[model samples]
Target: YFQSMIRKKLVVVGDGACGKTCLLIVFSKDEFPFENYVADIEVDGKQVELALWDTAGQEDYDRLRPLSYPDTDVILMCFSVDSPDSLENIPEKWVPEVKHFCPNVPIILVANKKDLRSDEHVRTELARMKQEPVRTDDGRAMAVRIQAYDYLECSAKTKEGVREVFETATRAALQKRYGS
Candidate 1:
């Protein structure tokens, strides 16, 4: 049942190239560009305290994921479509570890690099010629041993799909946790 009204804290997690920084920029500034390191929360309205955490995606940072997973209400799994290696790392590694730590937590898959649609198409065709259509969904399904809860494509450089990712995830998480 719905009861007290409280603000929610949002956390964004993904590989280094997965537009995590870009998404934060778009959500915070409504503008996207090349940004490194971190940025504080930039949402309007003083009602809720939005803590957006952008963590390093390197191997050294993988150990920190579990430490922060428990407190996160949502996890944005980012992978650059331009780099197949990031996608490959998700299933057997990232997905399992994240799930193990957060069990039923909601995870939204963000596929970055939509700007390279043509390139992706070419690669998909090449992969198809050799074997099958390039697995665009990543091993997400196979890795988690179940279908991904959701998926979205966006580009940090152009600010495309950035709004959708944050807006949708925010609404979904709020509904899920509050029954609103």
Candidate 2:
């Protein structure tokens, strides 16, 4: 009379240093990283065991990255709120790639580095390039355009909205599993 376990694969991808690694690490292990490394970690959700795959976002990994997509139940398509180019790359790069490989998988558009949205130094730096932090409305709009299941913003540094990202992702994965 035991309930069945739900196991799912979740892959995270975005531009290099766009906070993909930090988001997965902080969510899975509860620690912010001082260095970067790709990891495959198992995280326990309410009724699921999520196998989190951290992918390299550098162009160098493009040829090998799709190998992680075959069994993916959900995708965390991330971008840094402090970098306009990173957000721009969503439709230009990540979306196309994900749609090609895991066309049926659900995508959750994640805006990382939310802490930097209000950081004076980050604002000053972006201003030098004639840009500003990306707003939540813009992220939500992009989510709509890219057909993402949801849009979430979080800060690995401050741990804000971190758990919600995974929880929502788990829900998306479960929905896919149940064919909802």
- The best candidate by TM-score is 2
Q: Which segments of model 2 are wrong by more than 4 Å?
A: 1-4, 34-47, 177-180
Residue 82 of model 2, lDDT score: 88
- Candidate 1 Cα errors over 4 Å, as ranges: 1-5, 34-48, 57-59, 119-146, 177-180
Estimate candidate 2's alpha-carbon lDDT, on a 0 to 1 scale: 0.83
How large an RMSD does model 2 have? 4.1
lDDT of 1 by residue, 20-115 (tens): 666777777777663232222233342334456666554456566555555666677777766666676677667787778766667787777677
lDDT of 2 by residue, 15-118 (tens): 88899888877986798872323233244534556778878654467678788788888999999988989999999999999889987889999999999988
User: With candidate 2 superimposed using the best TM-score fit, by how many Å does residue 27's alpha carbon deviate from the native?
Assistant: 0.9
- TM-score of decoy 2: 0.86
* All-Cα superposition RMSD per candidate: 5.9, 4.1
